Specification:
It contains 21 helices and 9 strands. By secondary structure, it is an alpha+beta fold. tRNA nucleotidyltransferase involved in the synthesis of the tRNA CCA terminus. Adds the terminal adenosine residue to tRNA. Can incorporate CMP into tRNA ending with C74C75 (tRNACC), with very weak efficiency. It comes from Aquifex aeolicus (strain VF5).
């Protein structure tokens, strides 16, 4: 498709960035990024023209976004921020992100690795292209770790050194906030997010981000246990799934004050139920656990846990003594239903007697 046009236009187009990496990992990807030596915008517009789809141009950035089916295509002009593909590649973050593949007809199927990205790919290594990479873009401080968290990659010696230097320089605090917030929002999406938190604690990034935040053993243990709970719940009910990456965050900020924690969650643009679970965690959770341990009957637990959010219950599953109760509610208590004739005899106040009968049966 594209290579044809690149030939017709006498340009040179390349699949570029992490997409190439994911292809080398065999990962299926429907979002594809290109870098073009030529007019990238004209190439893209011609592509969309031939395919007869819509194309959104961006002259300012020098890029164009067009979508075909559910497959999304971006076409960027080669730049040093004309410039060669190598220049556009060397300005990126890491070696695994530094490669590209030609869709051009002659060299089609050729992977281009200048920096040994493929060499450093098999060794499970996160390696920056230039030594000032971190001071250049402080967000990378997190990013590297994030990658190292997901792919189980180890940082190269120089990379680690420069990382801890940049961190110690406090560039994290003086870095643009929105970018950091977005990167952290990107980190929670990972299922390897806990390992990323491990690297976070190791290189002490959160301490330079969140005000008055420090680490203790209890939080860590509760995070591991939280992972256990998450795994179990994801296992049992696959249709009840939610965003788990937030809960861990709620475990991290649980010690912090309500005001700055609220400001922080608002700063993260978190979902409603998350902030609601936070507010309910701060104030009324203690009395909740109190009267939960004091519950002699299962129906009272039903009444208590019914208005609660699912996340709240999953968070209540942490307590060793409260586990079987929560499990009972999930797989038994809430599944109680009734017949017809009984309802009709009750009708000869309704919901009252309904809860009365629930109170009758649910205690067995």
């Amino acid at each position: 498709m594209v290579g044809q046009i690149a030939k017709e236009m006498g340009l040179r187009a390349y699949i570029v960035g992490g997409v190439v990496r994911d292809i080398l990992l065999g990962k299926e990807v429907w979002d594809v990024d290109f870098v073009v030596e030529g007019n990238a915008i004209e190439l893209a517009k011609e592509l969309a023209r031939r395919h007869g789809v819509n194309v959104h141009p961006f002259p300012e950035f020098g890029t164009a976004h067009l979508k075909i089916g559910k497959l999304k295509l971006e076409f960027a002009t080669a730049r040093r921020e004309p410039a060669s593909l190598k220049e556009d590649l060397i300005r990126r973050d890491f070696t695994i992100n530094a490669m590209a593949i030609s869709v051009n007809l002659e060299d089609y199927g050729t992977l281009i690795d200048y920096f040994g990205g493929l060499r450093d790919l098999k060794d499970k290594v996160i390696r920056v292209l230039h030594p000032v990479s971190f001071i250049e873009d402080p967000v990378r401080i997190l990013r590297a770790l994030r990658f190292a968290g997901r792919l189980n990659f180890k940082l190269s010696r120089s990379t680690e050194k420069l990382l801890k230097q940049a961190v110690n320089l406090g560039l994290l605090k003086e870095a643009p906030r929105g970018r950091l917030i977005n990167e952290i929002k990107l980190a929670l999406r990972e299922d390897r997010f806990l390992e990323i938190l491990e690297l976070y604690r190791k290189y002490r990034v959160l301490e330079e981000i969140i005000e008055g935040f420090q680490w203790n053993e209890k939080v860590l243990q509760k995070l591991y246990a939280l992972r256990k709970v998450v795994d179990w719940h994801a296992l049992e009910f696959s249709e009840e799934r939610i965003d788990y990456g937030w809960l861990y965050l709620l475990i991290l900020i649980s010690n912090l004050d309500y005001e700055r924690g609220k400001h922080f969650l608002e700063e993260m643009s978190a979902p409603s139920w998350v902030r609601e679970t936070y507010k309910f965690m701060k104030f009324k959770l203690g009395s909740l656990k109190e009267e939960l341990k004091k519950a002699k009957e299962n129906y009272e637990v039903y009444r208590l846990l019914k208005p609660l959010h699912t996340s709240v219950l999953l968070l209540l599953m942490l307590e060793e003594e409260l586990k079987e109760k929560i499990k009972l509610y999930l797989e038994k208590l809430r599944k109680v239903k009734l017949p017809k004739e009984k309802i009709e005899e009750l009708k000869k106040e309704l919901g009252e007697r309904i809860e009365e009968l629930k109170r009758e049966i649910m205690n067995k």
